[PDB]
Amino acid sequence: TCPFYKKIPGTGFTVDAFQYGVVEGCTAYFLTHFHSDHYAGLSKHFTFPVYCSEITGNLLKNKLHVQEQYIHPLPLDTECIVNGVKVVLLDANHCPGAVMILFYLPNGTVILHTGDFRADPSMERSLLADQKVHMLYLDTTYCSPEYTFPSQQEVIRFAINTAFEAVTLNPHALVVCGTYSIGKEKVFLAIADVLGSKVGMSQEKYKTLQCLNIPEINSLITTDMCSSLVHLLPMMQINFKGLQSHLKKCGGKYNQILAFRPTGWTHSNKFTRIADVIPQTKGNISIYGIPYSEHSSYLEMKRFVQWLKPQKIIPTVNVGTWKSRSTMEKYFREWKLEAGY
Ligand code: NI
């Protein structure tokens, strides 16, 4: 059965609730972004209205085959009426097409559902600035102070500098980057850009990237592996066995692999700086784990919430244990006492 934190009171609406069958009372199903834990349950036989971004709607049609008549894309930053209720979609600074949803209830309550997000000070100058928000449905993935990681810009700088150095020392080195969902496209695009190459990938991944409205994408990616010196592979293949097997397939064109795994957080973050990160190596293969996050750090999350000053917070992540729930509730109270709301 559908959990309470996926339901929007005072409406016929649910958020990211496609794996519970026909939800009793639901006249519109919103989808925040195209990640499988959130779309789980959607398929070509779905017959209810789905509300989402243009980009999410491209992926629903092309990848899941949802029929067009049930896909309702909305523009961002624009007041829209859905089944008699004003809503706005905001950029969530997560993966391509990811949104936060503002609901303006008929009784006067305003609710923000963040979906998955990476909080940013720029959000303090969106349409959120313009009225009070009573209830916040919050992505609490990294809601604990140990969760530190660098800016996306610092991480991309590390990756660009590492790749350009290795390939300039050895022009016969191949760069490989892991992927298993949309998001984090800057990692492989920034590295291919410094090397003067397109990124090579499977037909299935090329198809996915052609749904994302990235400017000038036809100039940046390709299915011809032979012409490319940055290859994308499934995340499961980014290990010594998988990468050895891939190098065999390249027909003696290359004699060294440098590979990147963009993880979220890893406990090496508590001690080590981004400057100081070192790879795991075996022979002519080196693997870097780089902390490129599409979710808020603890400090970024705290700044956002202390700015927004909501009356009530409903977590949407880490809700399955009493210890987690109690931990999160303590931090919410600290924040509220420190700021005075
Ligand atoms: Ni996500």
Find out whether 39 and 6 touch, Cβ atoms under 8 Å: no
**Which residues, 6 or more positions from 304, have their beta carbon under 8 angstroms from its beta carbon?**
119, 123, 124, 296
* 185-195 helix and 152-169 helix, angle to the nearest 10 degrees: 40
Find out whether 76 and 56 touch, Cβ atoms under 8 Å: no
State the distance from the centre of ligand 1 to the C-alpha of 249, rounded, in angstroms: 33
83 torsion bin: left (phi>0), alpha (psi -120 to 50), beta (else): left
Tell me the residues surrounding ligand 1 (ion) with CB < 5 Å. Answer: 35, 116
State the distance from the centre of ligand 1 to the C-alpha of 250, rounded, in angstroms: 33
Domains parsed from the chain with CATH numbers: 1-147+296-341 (3.60.15.10), 148-295 (3.40.50.12650)
State the distance from the centre of ligand 1 to the C-alpha of 35, rounded, in angstroms: 5
Q: Is 309 exposed, middle or buried (0-12, 13-18, 19+ CB in 10 A)?
A: middle
DSSP line for 138-185: E--TT-STT-----HHHHHHHHHHHHHHHHHH-TTEEEEEEESSS--H
Q: Is the dihedral of CA 37, 83, 73, 97 positive or negative?
A: negative
CA distance 9 to 85: 12
Beta sheet of 280-282, edge-to-edge order:
221-222, 199-200, 230-234, 173-179, 256-263, 285-291, 280-282
State the distance from the centre of ligand 1 to the C-alpha of 39, rounded, in angstroms: 10
Q: Is the dihedral of CA 121, 124, 128, 134 positive or negative?
A: positive
| Short-list 240, 232, 169, 244, CA closest to 199 | 232
Q: Where are the alpha helices (DSSP H) in 93-151?
A: none
CA distance 35 to 182: 7
CA distance 295 to 92: 10
CA distance 194 to 173: 14
CA distance 84 to 63: 30
State the distance from the centre of ligand 1 to the C-alpha of 52, rounded, in angstroms: 14
> Experimentally, how was this structure solved?
X-ray
CA distance 21 to 18: 7
CA distance 229 to 192: 8
State the distance from the centre of ligand 1 to the C-alpha of 126, rounded, in angstroms: 21
Q: Which helix (H) or strand (E) holds 327?
A: helix 322-339
CA distance 89 to 126: 11
